Amino acid sequence: EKIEGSKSLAQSWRMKDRMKTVSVALVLCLNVGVDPPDVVKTTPCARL
Amino acid sequence: HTMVVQAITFIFKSLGLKCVQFLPQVMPTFLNVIRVCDGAIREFLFQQLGMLVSFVKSHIRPYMDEIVTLMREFWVMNTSIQSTIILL
Secondary structure, three states, X not given: OOOOOOOOOOOOOOOOOOXXXXXXXXXXXXXXXXXXXXXXXXXXXXXX | OHHHHHHHHXXXXXXXXXXXXXXXXXXXXXXXXXXXXXXXXXXXXXXXXXXXXXXXXXXXXXXXXXXXXXHHHHOOOOHHHHHHHHHO
């Protein structure tokens, strides 16, 4: 073999940036105790 | 036989999803009618039950088990009832 260094490949494994989810928005349109007119819920329906 | 069920079907179609109210009344009788009916009426009833099910949609779950039993009992190699049940 020749006494020569192997050419290093373009190591792209490094992450470009680290994101941080700073805050969260929980918009809850539960409308507890009322049923939406569009959907006629069944008597058992889904309560949980 | 023919006029009664044509009415009940037309009533359910005109109401919409508010017919669900009447389900507990209609279904047990309607199923017992399919059991004791004979000859041609059977096919017609199964046709109209199909309409009923298309309107009731998800609400038909409690009575579905009985319907299957009905189908299982009255499925025959008779070509006529086979096409009817496959549509249902």
